[PDB]
PDB file of N, CA and C in Angstrom:
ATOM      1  N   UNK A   1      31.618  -2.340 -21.669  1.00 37.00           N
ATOM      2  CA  UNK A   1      31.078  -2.845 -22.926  1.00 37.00           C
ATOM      3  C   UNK A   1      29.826  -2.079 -23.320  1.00 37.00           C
ATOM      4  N   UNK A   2      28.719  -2.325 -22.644  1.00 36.82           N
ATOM      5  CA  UNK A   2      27.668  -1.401 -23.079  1.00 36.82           C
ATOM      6  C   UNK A   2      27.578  -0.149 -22.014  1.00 36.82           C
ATOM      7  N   UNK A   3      28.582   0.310 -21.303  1.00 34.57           N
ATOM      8  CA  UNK A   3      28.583   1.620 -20.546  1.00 34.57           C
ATOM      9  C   UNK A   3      28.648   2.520 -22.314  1.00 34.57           C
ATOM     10  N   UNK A   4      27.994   3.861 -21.719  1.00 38.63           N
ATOM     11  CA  UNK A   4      28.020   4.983 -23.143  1.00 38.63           C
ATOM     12  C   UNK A   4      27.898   6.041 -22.241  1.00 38.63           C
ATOM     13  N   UNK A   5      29.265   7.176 -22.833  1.00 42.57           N
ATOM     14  CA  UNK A   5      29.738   8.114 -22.558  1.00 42.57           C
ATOM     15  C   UNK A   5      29.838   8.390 -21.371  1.00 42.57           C
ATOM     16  N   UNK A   6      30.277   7.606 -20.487  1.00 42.13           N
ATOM     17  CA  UNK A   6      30.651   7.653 -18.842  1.00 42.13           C
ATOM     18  C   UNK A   6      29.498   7.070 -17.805  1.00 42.13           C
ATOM     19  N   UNK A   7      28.088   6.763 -18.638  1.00 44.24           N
ATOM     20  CA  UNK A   7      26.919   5.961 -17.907  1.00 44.24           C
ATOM     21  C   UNK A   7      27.342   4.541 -18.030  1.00 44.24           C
ATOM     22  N   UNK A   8      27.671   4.256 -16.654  1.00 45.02           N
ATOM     23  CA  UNK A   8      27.815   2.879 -16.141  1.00 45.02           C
ATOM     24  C   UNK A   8      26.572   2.114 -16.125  1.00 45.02           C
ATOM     25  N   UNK A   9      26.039   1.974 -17.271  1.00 42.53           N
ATOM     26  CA  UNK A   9      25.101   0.994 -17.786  1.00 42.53           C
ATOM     27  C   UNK A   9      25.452  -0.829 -17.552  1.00 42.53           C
ATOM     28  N   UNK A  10      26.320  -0.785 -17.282  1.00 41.45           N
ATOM     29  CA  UNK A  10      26.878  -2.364 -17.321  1.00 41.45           C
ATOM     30  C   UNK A  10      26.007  -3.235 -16.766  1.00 41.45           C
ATOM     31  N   UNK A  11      26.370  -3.063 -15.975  1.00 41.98           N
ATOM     32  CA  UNK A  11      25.286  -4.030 -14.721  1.00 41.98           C
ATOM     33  C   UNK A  11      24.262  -4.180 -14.774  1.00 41.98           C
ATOM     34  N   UNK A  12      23.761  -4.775 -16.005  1.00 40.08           N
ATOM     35  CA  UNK A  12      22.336  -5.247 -16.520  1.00 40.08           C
ATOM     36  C   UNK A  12      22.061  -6.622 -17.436  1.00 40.08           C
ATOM     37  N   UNK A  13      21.415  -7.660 -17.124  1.00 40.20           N
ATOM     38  CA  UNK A  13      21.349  -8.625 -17.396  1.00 40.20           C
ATOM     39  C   UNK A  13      20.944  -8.849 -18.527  1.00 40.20           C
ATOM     40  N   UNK A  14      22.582  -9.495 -19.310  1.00 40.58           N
ATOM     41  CA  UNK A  14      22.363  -9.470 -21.221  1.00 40.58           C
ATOM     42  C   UNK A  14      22.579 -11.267 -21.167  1.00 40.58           C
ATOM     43  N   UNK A  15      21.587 -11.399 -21.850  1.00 39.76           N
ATOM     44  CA  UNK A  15      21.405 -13.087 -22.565  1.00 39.76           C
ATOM     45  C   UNK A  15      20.700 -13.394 -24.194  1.00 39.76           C
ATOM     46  N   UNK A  16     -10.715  -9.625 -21.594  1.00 38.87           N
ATOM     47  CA  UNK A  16      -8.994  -9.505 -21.128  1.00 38.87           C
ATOM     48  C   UNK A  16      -8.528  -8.577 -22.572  1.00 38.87           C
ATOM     49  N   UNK A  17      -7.161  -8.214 -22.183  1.00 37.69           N
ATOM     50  CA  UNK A  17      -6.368  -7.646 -23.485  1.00 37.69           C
ATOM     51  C   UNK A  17      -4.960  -8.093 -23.082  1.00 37.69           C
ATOM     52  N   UNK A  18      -4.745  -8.532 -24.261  1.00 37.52           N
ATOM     53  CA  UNK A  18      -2.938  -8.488 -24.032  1.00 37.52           C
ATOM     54  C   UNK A  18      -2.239  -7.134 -24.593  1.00 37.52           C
ATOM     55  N   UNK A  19      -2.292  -6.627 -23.688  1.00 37.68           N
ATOM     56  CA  UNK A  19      -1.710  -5.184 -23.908  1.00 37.68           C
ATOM     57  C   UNK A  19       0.480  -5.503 -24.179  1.00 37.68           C
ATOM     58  N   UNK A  20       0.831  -4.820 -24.957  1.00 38.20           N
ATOM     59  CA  UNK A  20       2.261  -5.136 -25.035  1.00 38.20           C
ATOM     60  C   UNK A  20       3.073  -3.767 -24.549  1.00 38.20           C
ATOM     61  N   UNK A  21       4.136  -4.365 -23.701  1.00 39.21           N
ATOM     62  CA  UNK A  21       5.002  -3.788 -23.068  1.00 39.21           C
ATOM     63  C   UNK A  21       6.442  -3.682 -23.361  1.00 39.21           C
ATOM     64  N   UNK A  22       6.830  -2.274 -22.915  1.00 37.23           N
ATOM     65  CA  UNK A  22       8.298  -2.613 -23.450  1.00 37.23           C
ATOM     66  C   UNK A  22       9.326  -3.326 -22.214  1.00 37.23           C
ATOM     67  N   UNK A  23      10.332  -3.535 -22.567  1.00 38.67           N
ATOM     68  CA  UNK A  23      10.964  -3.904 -21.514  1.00 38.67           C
ATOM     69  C   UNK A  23      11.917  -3.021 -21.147  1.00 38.67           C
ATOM     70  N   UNK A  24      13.025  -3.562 -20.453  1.00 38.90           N
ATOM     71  CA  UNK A  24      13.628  -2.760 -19.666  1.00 38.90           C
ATOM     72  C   UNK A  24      13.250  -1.258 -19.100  1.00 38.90           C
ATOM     73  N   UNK A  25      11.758  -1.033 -19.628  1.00 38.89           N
ATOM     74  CA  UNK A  25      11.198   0.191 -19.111  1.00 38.89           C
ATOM     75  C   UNK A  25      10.208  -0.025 -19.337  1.00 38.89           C
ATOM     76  N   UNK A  26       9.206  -0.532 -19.019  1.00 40.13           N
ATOM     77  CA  UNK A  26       7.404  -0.898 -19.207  1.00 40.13           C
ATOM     78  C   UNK A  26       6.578  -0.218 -19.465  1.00 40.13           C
ATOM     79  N   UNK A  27       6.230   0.027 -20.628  1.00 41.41           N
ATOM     80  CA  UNK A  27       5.380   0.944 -20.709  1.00 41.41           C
ATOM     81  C   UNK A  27       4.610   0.362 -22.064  1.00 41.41           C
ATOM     82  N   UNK A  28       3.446   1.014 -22.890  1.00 38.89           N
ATOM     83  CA  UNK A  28       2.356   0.201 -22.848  1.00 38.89           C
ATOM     84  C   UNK A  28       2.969   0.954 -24.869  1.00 38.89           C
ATOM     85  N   UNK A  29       3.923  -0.320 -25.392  1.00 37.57           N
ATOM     86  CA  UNK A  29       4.237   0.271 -26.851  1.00 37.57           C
ATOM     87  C   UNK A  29       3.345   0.843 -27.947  1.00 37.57           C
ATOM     88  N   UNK A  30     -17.355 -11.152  39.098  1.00 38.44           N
ATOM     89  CA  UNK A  30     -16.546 -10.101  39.976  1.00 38.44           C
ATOM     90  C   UNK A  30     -17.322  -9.966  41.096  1.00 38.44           C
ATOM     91  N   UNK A  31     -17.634  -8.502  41.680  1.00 38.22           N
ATOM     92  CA  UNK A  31     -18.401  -8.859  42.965  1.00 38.22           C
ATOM     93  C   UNK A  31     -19.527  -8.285  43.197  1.00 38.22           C
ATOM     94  N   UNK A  32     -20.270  -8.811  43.760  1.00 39.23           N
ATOM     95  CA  UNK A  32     -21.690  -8.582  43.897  1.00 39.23           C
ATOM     96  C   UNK A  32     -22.105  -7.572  45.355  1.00 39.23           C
ATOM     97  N   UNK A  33     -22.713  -6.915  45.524  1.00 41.47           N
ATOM     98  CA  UNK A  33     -23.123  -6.078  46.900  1.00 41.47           C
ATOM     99  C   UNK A  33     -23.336  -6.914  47.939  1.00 41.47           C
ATOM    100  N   UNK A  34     -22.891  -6.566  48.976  1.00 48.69           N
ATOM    101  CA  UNK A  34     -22.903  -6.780  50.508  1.00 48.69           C
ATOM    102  C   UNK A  34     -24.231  -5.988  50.615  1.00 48.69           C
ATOM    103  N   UNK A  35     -25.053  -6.392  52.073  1.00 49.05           N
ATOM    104  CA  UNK A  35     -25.845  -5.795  52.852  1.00 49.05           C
ATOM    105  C   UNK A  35     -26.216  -4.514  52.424  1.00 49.05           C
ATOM    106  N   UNK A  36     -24.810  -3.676  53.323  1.00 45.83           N
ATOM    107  CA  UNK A  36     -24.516  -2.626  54.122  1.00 45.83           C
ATOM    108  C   UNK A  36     -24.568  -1.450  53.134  1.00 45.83           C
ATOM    109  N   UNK A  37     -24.318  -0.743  52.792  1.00 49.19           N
ATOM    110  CA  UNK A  37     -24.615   0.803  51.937  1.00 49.19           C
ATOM    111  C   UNK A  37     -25.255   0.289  50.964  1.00 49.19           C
ATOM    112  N   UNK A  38     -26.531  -0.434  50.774  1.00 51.15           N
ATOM    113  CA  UNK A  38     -27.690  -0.725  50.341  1.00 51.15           C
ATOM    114  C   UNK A  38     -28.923  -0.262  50.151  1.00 51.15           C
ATOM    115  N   UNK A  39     -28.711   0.817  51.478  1.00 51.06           N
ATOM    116  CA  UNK A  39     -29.801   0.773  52.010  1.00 51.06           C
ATOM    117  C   UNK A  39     -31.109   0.325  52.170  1.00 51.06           C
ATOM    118  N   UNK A  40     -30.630  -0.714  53.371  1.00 52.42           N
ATOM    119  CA  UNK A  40     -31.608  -1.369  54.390  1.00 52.42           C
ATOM    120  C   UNK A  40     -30.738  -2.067  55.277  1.00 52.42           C
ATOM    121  N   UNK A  41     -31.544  -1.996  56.666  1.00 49.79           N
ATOM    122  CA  UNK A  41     -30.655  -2.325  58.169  1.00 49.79           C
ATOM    123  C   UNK A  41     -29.893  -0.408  57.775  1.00 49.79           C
ATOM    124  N   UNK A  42     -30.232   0.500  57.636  1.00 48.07           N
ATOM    125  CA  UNK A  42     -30.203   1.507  57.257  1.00 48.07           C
ATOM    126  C   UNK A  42     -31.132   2.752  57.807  1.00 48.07           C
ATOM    127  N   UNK A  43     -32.263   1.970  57.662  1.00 48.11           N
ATOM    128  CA  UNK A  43     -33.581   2.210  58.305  1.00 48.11           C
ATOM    129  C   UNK A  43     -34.672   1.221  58.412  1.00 48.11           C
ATOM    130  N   UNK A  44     -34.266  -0.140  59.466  1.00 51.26           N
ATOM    131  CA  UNK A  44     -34.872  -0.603  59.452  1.00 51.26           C
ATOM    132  C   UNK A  44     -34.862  -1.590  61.373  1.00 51.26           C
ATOM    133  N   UNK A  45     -35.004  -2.535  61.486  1.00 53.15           N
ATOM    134  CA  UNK A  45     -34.330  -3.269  62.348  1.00 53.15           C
ATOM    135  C   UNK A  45     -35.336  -3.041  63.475  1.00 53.15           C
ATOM    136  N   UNK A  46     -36.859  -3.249  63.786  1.00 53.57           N
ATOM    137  CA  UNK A  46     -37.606  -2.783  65.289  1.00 53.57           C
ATOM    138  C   UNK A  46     -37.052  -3.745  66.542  1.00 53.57           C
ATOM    139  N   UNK A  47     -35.781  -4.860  66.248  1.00 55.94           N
ATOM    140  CA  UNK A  47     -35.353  -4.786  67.311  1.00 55.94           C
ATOM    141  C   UNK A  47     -34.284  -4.402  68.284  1.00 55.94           C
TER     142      UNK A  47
ATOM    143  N   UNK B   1      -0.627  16.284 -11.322  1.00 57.75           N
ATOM    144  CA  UNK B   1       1.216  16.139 -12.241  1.00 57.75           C
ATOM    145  C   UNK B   1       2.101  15.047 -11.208  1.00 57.75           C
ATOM    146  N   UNK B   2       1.481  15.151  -9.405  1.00 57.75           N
ATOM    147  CA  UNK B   2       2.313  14.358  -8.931  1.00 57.75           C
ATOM    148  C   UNK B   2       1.330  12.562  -8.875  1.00 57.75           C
ATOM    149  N   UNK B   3       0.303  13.178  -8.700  1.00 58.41           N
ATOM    150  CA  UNK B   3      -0.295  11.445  -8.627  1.00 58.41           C
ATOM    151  C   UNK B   3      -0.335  10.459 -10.321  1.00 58.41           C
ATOM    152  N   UNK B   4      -0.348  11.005 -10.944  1.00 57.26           N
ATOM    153  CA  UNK B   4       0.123  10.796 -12.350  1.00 57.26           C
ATOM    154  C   UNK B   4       1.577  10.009 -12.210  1.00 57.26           C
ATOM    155  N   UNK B   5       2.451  10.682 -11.615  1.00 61.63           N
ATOM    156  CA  UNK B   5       3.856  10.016 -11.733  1.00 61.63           C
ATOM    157  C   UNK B   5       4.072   8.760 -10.541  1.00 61.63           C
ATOM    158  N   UNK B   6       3.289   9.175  -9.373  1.00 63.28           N
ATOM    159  CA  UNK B   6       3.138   7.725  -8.517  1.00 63.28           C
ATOM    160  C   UNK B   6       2.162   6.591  -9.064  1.00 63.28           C
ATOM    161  N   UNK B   7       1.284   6.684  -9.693  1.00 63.25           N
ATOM    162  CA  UNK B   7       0.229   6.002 -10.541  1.00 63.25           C
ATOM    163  C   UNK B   7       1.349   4.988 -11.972  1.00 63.25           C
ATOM    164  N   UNK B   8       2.418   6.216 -12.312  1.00 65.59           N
ATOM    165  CA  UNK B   8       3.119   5.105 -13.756  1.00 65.59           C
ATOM    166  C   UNK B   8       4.020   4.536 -12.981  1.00 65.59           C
ATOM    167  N   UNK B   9       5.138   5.028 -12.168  1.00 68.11           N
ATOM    168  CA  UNK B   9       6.099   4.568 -11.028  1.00 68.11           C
ATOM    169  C   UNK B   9       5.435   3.015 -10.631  1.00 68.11           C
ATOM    170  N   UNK B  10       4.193   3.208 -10.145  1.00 68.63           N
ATOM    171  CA  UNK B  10       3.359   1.799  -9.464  1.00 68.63           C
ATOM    172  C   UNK B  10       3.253   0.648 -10.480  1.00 68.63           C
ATOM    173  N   UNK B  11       2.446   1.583 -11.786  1.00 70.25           N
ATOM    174  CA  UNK B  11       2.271   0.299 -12.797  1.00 70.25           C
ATOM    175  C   UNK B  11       3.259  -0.129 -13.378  1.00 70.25           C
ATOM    176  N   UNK B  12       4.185   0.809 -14.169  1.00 68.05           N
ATOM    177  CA  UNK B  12       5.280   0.446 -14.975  1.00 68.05           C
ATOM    178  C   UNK B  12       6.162  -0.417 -13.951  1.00 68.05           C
ATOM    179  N   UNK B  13       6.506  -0.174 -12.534  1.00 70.11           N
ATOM    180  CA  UNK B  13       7.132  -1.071 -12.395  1.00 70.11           C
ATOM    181  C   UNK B  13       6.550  -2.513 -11.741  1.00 70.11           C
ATOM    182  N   UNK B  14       5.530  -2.531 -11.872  1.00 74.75           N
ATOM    183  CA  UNK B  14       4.378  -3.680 -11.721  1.00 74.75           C
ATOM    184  C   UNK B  14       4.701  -4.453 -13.060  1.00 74.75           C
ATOM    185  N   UNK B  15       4.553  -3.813 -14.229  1.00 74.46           N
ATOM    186  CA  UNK B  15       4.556  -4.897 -15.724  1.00 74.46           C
ATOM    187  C   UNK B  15       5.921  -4.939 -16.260  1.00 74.46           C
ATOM    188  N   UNK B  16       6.802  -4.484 -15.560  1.00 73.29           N
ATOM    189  CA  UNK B  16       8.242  -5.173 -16.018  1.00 73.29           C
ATOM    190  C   UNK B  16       8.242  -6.710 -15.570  1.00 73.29           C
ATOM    191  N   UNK B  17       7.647  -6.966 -14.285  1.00 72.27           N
ATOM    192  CA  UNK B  17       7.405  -8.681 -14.082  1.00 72.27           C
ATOM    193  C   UNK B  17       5.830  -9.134 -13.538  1.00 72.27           C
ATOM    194  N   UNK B  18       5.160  -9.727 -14.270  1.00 74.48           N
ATOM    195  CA  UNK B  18       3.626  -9.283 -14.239  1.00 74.48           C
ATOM    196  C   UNK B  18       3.098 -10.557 -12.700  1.00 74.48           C
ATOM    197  N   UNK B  19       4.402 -11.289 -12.579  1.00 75.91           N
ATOM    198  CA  UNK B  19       3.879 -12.967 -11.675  1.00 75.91           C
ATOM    199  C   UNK B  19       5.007 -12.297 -10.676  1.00 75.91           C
ATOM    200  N   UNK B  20       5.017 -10.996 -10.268  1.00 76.87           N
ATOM    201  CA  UNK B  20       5.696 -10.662  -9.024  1.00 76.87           C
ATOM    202  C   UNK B  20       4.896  -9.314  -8.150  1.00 76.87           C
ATOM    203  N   UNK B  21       4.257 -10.298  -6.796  1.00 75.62           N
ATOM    204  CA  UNK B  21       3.486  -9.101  -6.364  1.00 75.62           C
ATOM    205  C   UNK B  21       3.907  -7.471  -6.180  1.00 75.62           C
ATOM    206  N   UNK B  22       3.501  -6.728  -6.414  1.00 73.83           N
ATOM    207  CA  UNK B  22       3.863  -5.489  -6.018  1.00 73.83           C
ATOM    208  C   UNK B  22       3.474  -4.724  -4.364  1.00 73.83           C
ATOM    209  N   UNK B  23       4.072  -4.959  -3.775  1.00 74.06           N
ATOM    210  CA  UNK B  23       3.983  -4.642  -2.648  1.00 74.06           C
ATOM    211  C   UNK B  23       3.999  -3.288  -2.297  1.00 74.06           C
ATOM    212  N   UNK B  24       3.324  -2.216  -1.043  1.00 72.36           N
ATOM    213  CA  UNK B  24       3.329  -1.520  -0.826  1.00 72.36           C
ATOM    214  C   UNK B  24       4.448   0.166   0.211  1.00 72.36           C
ATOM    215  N   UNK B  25       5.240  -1.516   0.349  1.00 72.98           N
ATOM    216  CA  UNK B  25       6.771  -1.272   0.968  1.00 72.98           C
ATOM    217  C   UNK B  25       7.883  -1.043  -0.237  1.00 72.98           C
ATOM    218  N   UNK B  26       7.787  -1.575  -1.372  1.00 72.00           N
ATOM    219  CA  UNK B  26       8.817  -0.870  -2.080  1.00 72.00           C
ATOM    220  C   UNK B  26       8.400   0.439  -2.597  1.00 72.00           C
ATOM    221  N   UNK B  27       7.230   1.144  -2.828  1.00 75.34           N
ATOM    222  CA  UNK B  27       6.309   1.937  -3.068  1.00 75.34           C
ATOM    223  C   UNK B  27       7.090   3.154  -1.631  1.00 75.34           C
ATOM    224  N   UNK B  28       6.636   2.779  -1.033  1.00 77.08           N
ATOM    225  CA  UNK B  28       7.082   4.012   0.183  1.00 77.08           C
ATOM    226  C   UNK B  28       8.430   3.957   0.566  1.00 77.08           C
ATOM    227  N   UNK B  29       9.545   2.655  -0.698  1.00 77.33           N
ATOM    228  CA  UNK B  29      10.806   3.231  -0.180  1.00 77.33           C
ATOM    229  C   UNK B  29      11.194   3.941  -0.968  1.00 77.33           C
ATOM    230  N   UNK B  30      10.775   3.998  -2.667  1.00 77.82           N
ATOM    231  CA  UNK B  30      11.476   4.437  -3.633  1.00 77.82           C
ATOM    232  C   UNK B  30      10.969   5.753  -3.664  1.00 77.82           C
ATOM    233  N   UNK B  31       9.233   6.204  -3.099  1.00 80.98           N
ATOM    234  CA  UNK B  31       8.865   7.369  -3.800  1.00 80.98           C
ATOM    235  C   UNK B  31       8.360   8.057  -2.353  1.00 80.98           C
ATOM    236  N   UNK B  32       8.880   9.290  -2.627  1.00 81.91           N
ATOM    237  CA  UNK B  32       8.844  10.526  -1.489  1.00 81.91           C
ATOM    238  C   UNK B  32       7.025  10.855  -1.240  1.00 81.91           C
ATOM    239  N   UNK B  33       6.621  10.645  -0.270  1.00 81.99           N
ATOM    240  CA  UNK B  33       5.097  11.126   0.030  1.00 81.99           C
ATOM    241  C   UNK B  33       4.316  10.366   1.162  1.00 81.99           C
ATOM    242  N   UNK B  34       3.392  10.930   1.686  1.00 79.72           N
ATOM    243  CA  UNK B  34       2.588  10.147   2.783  1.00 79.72           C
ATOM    244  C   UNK B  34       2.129   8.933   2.595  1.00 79.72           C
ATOM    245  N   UNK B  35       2.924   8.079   3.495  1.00 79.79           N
ATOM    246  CA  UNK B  35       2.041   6.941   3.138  1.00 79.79           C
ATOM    247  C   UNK B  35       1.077   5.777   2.837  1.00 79.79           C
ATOM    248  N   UNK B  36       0.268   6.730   3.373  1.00 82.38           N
ATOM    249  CA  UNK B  36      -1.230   6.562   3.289  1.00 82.38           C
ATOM    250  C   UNK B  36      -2.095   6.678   2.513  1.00 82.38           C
ATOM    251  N   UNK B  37      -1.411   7.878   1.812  1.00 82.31           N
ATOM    252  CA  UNK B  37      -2.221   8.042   0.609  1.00 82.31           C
ATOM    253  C   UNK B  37      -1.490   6.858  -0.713  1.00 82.31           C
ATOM    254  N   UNK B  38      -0.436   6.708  -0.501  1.00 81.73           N
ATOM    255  CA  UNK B  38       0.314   5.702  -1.127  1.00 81.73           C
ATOM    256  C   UNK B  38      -0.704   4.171  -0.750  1.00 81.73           C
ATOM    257  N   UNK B  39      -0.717   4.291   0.405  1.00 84.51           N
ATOM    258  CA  UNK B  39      -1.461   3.104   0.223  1.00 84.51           C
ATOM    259  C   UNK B  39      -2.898   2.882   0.509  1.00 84.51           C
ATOM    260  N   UNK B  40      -3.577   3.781   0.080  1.00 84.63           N
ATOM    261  CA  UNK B  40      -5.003   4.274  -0.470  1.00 84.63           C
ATOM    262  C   UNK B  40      -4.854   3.792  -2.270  1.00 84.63           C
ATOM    263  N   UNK B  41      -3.582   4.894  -2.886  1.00 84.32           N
ATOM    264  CA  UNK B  41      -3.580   4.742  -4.267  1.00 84.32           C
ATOM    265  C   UNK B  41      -3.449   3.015  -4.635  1.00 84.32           C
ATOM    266  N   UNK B  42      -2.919   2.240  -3.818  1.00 87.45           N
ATOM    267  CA  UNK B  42      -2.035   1.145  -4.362  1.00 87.45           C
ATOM    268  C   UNK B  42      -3.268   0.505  -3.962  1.00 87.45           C
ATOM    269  N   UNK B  43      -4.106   0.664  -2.810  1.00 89.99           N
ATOM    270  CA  UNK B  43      -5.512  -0.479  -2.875  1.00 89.99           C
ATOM    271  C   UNK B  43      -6.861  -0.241  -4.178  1.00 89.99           C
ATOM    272  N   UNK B  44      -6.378   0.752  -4.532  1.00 90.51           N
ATOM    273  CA  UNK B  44      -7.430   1.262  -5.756  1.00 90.51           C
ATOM    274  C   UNK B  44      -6.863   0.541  -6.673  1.00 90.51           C
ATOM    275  N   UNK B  45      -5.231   0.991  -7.450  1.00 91.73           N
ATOM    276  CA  UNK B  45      -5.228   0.262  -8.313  1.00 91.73           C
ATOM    277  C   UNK B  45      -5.486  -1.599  -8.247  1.00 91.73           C
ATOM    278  N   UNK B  46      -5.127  -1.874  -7.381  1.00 91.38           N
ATOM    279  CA  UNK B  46      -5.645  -3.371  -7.364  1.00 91.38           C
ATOM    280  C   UNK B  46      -6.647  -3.724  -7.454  1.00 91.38           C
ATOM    281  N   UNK B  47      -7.551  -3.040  -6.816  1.00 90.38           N
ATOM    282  CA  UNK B  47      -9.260  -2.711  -7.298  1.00 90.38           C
ATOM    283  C   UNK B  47      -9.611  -3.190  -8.639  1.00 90.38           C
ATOM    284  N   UNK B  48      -9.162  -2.408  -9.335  1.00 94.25           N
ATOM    285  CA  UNK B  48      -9.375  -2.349 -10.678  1.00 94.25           C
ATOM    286  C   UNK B  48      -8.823  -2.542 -11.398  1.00 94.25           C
ATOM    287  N   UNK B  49      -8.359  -4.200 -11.305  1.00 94.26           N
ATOM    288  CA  UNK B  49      -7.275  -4.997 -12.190  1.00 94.26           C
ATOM    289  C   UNK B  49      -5.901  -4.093 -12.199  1.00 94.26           C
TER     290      UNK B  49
END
């Protein structure tokens, strides 16, 4: 019906500013240390 | 000549339905380019109405 010249057009649904638009195409119209490697008891201890 | 045509692509098909968000996923399915900069362009235009 509205296909033209072999374009399968069919399949399309027929029924501030205000700017106007067109349609069908829009456009504008842990852990803590240990002692030990501390050092002390390392060099210490006179007994 | 090309950001010009992703810029009308974005709006024009933004004001064919003005109460339908335009999202940034139909944007990087329809139009060929990085999309980053796609969606650089698309947070600007929202920017600025």
């Amino acid at each position: 019906x509205x296909x033209x010249x072999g374009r399968x057009x069919x399949x399309x649904p027929x029924x501030x500013x205000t700017x106007x638009v067109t349609x069908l195409x829009x456009x504008x119209x842990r852990x803590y240390l240990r002692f030990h490697x501390x050092x002390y008891x390392x060099x210490x201890x006179x007994x | 000549e090309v950001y010009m045509r992703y810029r009308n692509f974005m709006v024009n098909s933004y004001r064919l339905n003005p109460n339908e968000y335009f999202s940034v996923t139909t944007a990087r399915r329809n139009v060929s380019g990085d999309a980053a900069a796609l969606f650089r362009l698309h947070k600007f235009l929202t920017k600025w109405g």
